[PDB]
């Protein structure tokens, strides 16, 4: 509403801003950001096939998936905030956020939103193995940068039985094969 | 293809890696990424309404306009690169980019950054002023953050005359009210 798009958008600027949690705890050196994160998610909407799928939604969706993070922060499982609390947190936070948006745009934000929390699409679903796929695909990254192998492990661990997309599946696989040599290789 | 849409990915995800040079140059401590720089224009895209315009093709548009710098780098002004050499070293990456991905992929994303680099639709111009009032904002929030009011006038300046959609004007002139009003007010 010029004023209130301009607080809009100074919201959204501070996912800038919010480091992505699960590196700091592992003191990983200059973390990426949760917009950086996004913006990844957002691509692999664009280039990983599924004619099933509204794709403009699903970029939508990566675009708005971690947006309440502006507020809430981003929040790992080490920090141990209850299932119903972080829904709590986030909802609090996106309707603080797209009430500053005119009724149209406040709408079908806050239902973008909703959708990718609920899960209740298969758009979402999607969506969701892409954040996933992201960063383990990051972790590997890290890894890489670090000359240190194998050190975020833990990433892989926690994805177990996540992907369920055939196109998603192989990326990972082929990933995690990759990775594998790595790790083999540099211990010798 | 597998290890090429991987391959495709970690290029990608350098642009968490390239640093806005812009700020770099006026020694902005932690810098926004290529890929922040990105996520908050799609997200204008979505919000800064122009129902004149596919909208959809407006967020891709966002998404691939920065795409080559994973490569080539942000150049700025102060780089002095002439336009013609910065649009061949543009196009040779976006080639190495663009056919890791299948033909339906590397054209349609080879034709997005063709047409937002061209200048050549209504929606590219749009995202085109896009980049600029994001840029913009970016340097009045720099200026808070750093508590120096006005440091950052150049990129102000830079942007004289180059915004013509009438919500973008809007938004841009009232950024300068907030922040003239700021800076008047430091000075007492
Ligand atoms: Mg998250
Ligand atoms: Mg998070
Ligand atoms: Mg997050
Ligand atoms: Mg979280
Ligand atoms: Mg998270
Ligand atoms: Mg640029
Ligand atoms: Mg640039
Ligand atoms: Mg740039
Ligand atoms: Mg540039
Ligand atoms: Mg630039």
Redesign the interface.
Same mark, same amino acid.
């Given at each position: 509403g /010029?004023?209130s =798009?301009?607080q809009? =958008? @100074?919201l %959204?600027?501070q996912?800038?801003r919010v480091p992505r949690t699960g590196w700091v705890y592992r003191n990983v050196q200059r973390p &990426?950001?949760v917009?950086?994160h996004?913006? @990844?998610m /957002? %691509?692999?909407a664009?280039?990983?096939?599924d004619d099933r799928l509204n794709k403009?939604r699903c970029? @939508?969706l990566a675009?708005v998936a971690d947006m309440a993070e502006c507020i809430v922060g981003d929040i790992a499982p080490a920090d141990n905030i209850p299932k119903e609390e972080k829904h709590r947190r986030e909802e609090e936070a996106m309707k603080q956020i797209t009430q500053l $948006?005119p009724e149209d745009?406040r709408k079908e $934000?806050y239902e973008l939103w909703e959708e990718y929390e609920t899960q209740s699409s298969a758009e979402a679903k999607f969506v969701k193995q892409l954040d996933q796929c992201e960063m383990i $695909?990051?972790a590997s &990254?890290y890894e890489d940068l670090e000359h240190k192998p194998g050190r975020l492990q833990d990433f892989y661990d926690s994805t177990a039985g996540k992907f369920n997309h055939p196109e998603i599946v192989?990326?990972v696989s082929? =990933?995690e094969a &990759?990775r594998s040599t790595n790790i083999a290789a540099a211990a010798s």
């Open positions: /010029a004023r =798009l301009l809009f =958008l @100074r %959204v600027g996912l800038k &990426e950001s917009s950086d996004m913006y @990844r /957002a %691509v692999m664009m280039v990983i096939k403009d970029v @939508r675009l $948006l745009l $934000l $695909l990051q &990254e192989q990326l082929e =990933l &990759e």
